[PDB]
Assembly symmetry: D2
Homo-oligomer: 251 residues x 4
């Protein structure tokens, strides 16, 4: 039987590319999404057309709240319901926007979104994933190669991504006796924000030492595929930068 993977925030961009590659490697996939319903169902069709009964969608808001644990349990439950198993969790979904320290969402909303999506939901998902467990079980967290050289005024985002590092490490340690690996992949600049002006994009591109270009979504996914594969069986608690040297560049 074919193994199954959950990918959060998988309707578009990097998450989609991870879902597509996992699928091409032989996985059945839960394509989680929040707002991008059309793109998610569209991807599940593309996939199932290629191999029938291999992709389902699963809608969930991953903002922090008192129901997030239930929501996360349900994303995992959904994989077992469609496919009878859950081998791989990829925590990819993430909110990303500035939260300046000094002065239209309230600040409690900003905490819930940025820390929910980037850290707490991954914790809750990781918890449900393990509670529900030949086998090659692993988790891959989408981290950030620039965590120690952060975007200006992005303190909540950055705090989320730092937490995700801590979770990668704590979970690898605690879950290792159960044969579940936990690793990360840390893009530098990859697919840039849709809302970002083209001048800002180029300004980021020209900083990258390897090819003066952002990573493709496919390049991020390749690292993911490696970490879940048989060639990474002794790897746990590792975070692989996939940043073309960007974090190596001084101010």
């Amino acid at each position: 039987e074919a193994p199954a993977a959950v990918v959060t925030g998988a309707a578009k961009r990097i998450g989609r590319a991870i879902a597509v590659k996992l699928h091409q490697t032989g996985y059945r996939v839960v394509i989680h999404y929040h707002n991008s319903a059309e793109a998610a169902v569209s991807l599940a069709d593309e996939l199932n057309k290629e191999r029938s009964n291999t992709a389902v969608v699963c809608q969930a808001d991953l903002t922090n709240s008192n129901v997030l644990p239930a929501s996360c349990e349900e994303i995992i439950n959904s994989c077992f319901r469609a496919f009878g198993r859950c081998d791989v969790l990829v925590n990819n979904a993430s909110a990303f926007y500035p939260t300046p320290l000094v002065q239209g969402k309230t600040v409690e909303t900003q905490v819930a979104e940025l820390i929910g999506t980037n850290a707490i939901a991954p914790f809750l998902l990781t918890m449900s994933f393990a509670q529900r467990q030949s086998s090659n079980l692993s988790i891959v967290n989408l981290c950030d190669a620039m965590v120690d050289q952060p975007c200006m005024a992005f303190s909540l985002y950055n705090m989320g991504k730092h937490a995700l590092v801590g979770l990668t490490q704590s979970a690898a340690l605690e879950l290792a006796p159960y044969g579940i690996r936990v690793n990360g992949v840390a893009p530098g600049v990859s697919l840039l924000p849709v809302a970002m002006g083209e001048e800002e994009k180029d300004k980021w591109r020209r900083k990258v030492p390897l090819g003066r270009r952002e990573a493709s979504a496919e390049q991020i996914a390749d690292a993911v595929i490696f970490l879940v594969s048989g060639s990474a069986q002794y790897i746990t608690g590792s975070i692989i930068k996939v940043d073309g040297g960007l974090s190596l560049v001084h101010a």
Copy 2:
């Protein structure tokens, strides 16, 4: 005029020793507390005996919630109302307990407490601190030297402390133009929990290369004193381990 400091969770143990030494150095202090009113009041009385009108207490729950921002703004305001100013914020209060990933606080409460005290309250206190602003303004976050070799099954605690490194860095960068420096002190093993058997304390003590003992609260306070002093005026984004070499010791 004497500068003023806020110390969170200042009733006991490390934060008390921090508030004491700060006061000894000529700071006026807001002693924040959650449940330990009697120790907090007793500390304020001892301090006011040394110098009249130099200590006040301030009670608040720092658990994450919709009211946390106002609570943190109110703690900063309390310093200004007492002393006319606020030069130093020390984020010391912290919840600490296991949150195993597998197998009666609900998990959303644990999240709120662990991530609220260790990370989100610090962020909101930082916001309110900066919003309200010779002078030497700084923030010191109480971090954790073992954050990359975490305690088994303390994943939410650990996630909190990592998020705290993130804030320390992100805030140093963003607040440096206001002349606010932001740093950390990272104990390894300091004062062990009150109930802990001495035999269990000895397992940790024995691990410490420098003296086979835990740091006193006073030794942790010394590093805070240094970070706030005129001797550290170019230091921001720095986290000083005060750990006796514990973090260098392999398994």
Copy 3:
């Protein structure tokens, strides 16, 4: 045309596994050795049995000296001579023994810092100077911040190797040369080490309470040289079964 790879210290143990896998992936390989001539040649014989003229051996002391630069230049020339090209350099060779703070100490400097950092720097200079999917992989150490007691110089060499990884990644990026690392925790334990001291280390490893095989270290190396890692440079991948996460 098949790409070619230099592997230093490739007669035995992890270097041999890296060479074999590179060969199984389709590389032609230079098997560098210092004392292990017999083992180096039997590897090459075995590899050339699978495919003729795809494995050569290359001898050199990698101890720091006045002659090390030439020696390192020659290891690279030996790949160009055998195969017309050099696509991959694996810095694996390494001296490893204690140097307590309280052989002459100057010889320990020369071996431990020469093998672990200086020779890698010189091999990197020569690789780049003679210059598709080009990369260098350095064998680092996952325990480099929780070092073994009384192993200063080794630890200094492995920290230096981290710095070279980073500096060379940054500086060779414009030539399309990627520079990465693989950091074993505990893999094949030293031959001398007592079986009881071996079991103490095995017990510490969270993922399976066993060391990494050489093949597991090599898989990471294979990934790093592959078209699947074309945006990765200045990365060091730990392959340590979580050992580095385990507090004292």
Copy 4:
């Protein structure tokens, strides 16, 4: 009796500031120097004029060679000979210049100077200091806050500074049982090279978030003074950045 300190490369710039400050704190100091004999005795004269018999010079090349161990052993011997003890060792001397990987001195000589001054000499001096020994013994290594975002084409220097981090850690661990603490101080930009053009100094200055200026040599020396002081007696294996936030600024 007053304690004694050895400061390598102490004739000028940061080394001088450390020796001066250590002197004002009440230390007797060995002023090690290499080529700067005039500045070195001139400093020793000044300091001896404040307190007679409290400063001596000591000439040594710290380039790696087969006699380097003897040279480093004799530096320590020179402190015991002048003062009857050696409490503090500051490893400040450093060669600093580019060594491009792709194309003056031979490369053997570049290795010996850059790795010698920055790593090997400090290791040997550490062996010698330890071998000679309520007091307060410590070593302070002058590191580099930018080691993970290094200067382009400075690989050997950068390798030297990484090695010095490894020494700081390995030595703190191995020497702790002897009550010898080993720490570091890591400038980002402090005094710029004398040969640097002012236009180019300002480029680096503008990168610093905290004041858009370089650290004064006194500001570096302050962190050294803290680490050797009784306020740091539980600190070992710690490297304190003094970089004004420079290391946190992305490309």
